[PDB]
C-alpha cells in the first residue's frame, strides 16, 4: 500500500503521481 | 501504529496537491 | 478556483479522518 | 460533487460520508 | 488526557467523537 | 522527540473537522 | 459559505502552537 | 469573540494564550 | 508576488516550482 | 480579509513538498 | 527519517504562523 | 539547522522566531 511504500521510505512527487486517478 | 495513521494524512494532502485534475483514489491499509 | 482548491485541501483531510478503513474517492470536477 | 456541495455550505460529518468508499 | 489515549494508539472516529459536545 | 507534539497538531485538527458545530475539548492536565 | 469553517481549521493550529503545554477547548459559534 | 475577530483580521500569537486551558 | 498569483487562481506543480530557490 | 493569510499557510506547505531538498524563501508582502 | 519529512511539513507551517509578515527561508537536511 | 533542532526537540513559538525574517 501507499503507506508501506511511502511512509517507510520517502516518496517523490513523481512516485506519488502513481496513486493519482 | 499512530505514525502510519499520521503519515497517511500527509499522503492524502500530498496527493491532493499532485493529482490536480485527474483526482485520486484512496484506501487505507489494515 | 483556489476557493475550491483551498477548501479541497481541507475536504480530503476530513474524509480521511471520517472514512477510516473504508477509504475514500476524491474527484476534481474540472 | 463534494466541492459544489461542500465548499458552498459546510458539510455535515454524515454528508461527508456519502463520499466514503 | 487526549494525548495519552490518542497518541499512544489510534483513536477511531468514535473515540475522537467523545471529545466533541 | 516531537512525536506526541506533532500528533497533537493532528488531534486538534481532527476534532475540529469531526465535531463541526458541537466544538470540542482538548485536554492534557486533568 | 465556509469562510469561517476554513479559517477556524487554521486558527485551531495557531491555538495549538501557543497553548501546547496548556491546551485549549474550541466552540463553533464562539 | 476571538474567532470572528481573528477571521476578519489577522491575530497576533500573543493574544491567543488567553484561550489556553 | 506568490499570493497575488496562487491564491486568486490555482498554481500547478509546475508554477509552484518556480519559487524553489 | 484573512484570505491571503490562510492561503499562505497552504503555499508554504505546497512548496515544502515541491522544492524538496532545494528549499525556499517565503514572504507576505507579495 | 520519514519522521524527518513529516516534521518538516509541521515546521514550515508553524514558522509561517509565527513569523507572518517577516517570513523565512527554509532548507532541507541531508 | 532548524530541522535538526526542532525535530528532535520541541520548539515553542519563542524558539521558532529565531528562524524568521
Ligand atoms: Cl483556506
Ligand atoms: Cl506527523
Ligand atoms: Zn485552509
Ligand atoms: Zn503530521
Swiss-Prot record, chains B, C, F, G, J, K:
Species per Swiss-Prot/TrEMBL record: Homo sapiens (Human)
Domain of life: Eukaryota
Protein's name according to its UniProt entry: Insulin B chain
Name of encoding gene: INS
Amino acid at each position: 500500500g501507499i503507506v508501506e511504500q511511502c511512509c517507510t521510505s520517502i516518496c517523490s512527487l513523481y512516485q506519488l503521481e502513481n496513486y493519482c486517478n | 501504529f499512530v505514525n502510519q495513521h499520521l503519515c497517511g494524512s500527509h499522503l492524502v494532502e500530498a496527493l491532493y496537491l499532485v493529482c490536480x485534475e485527474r483526482x485520486f483514489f484512496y484506501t487505507k491499509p489494515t
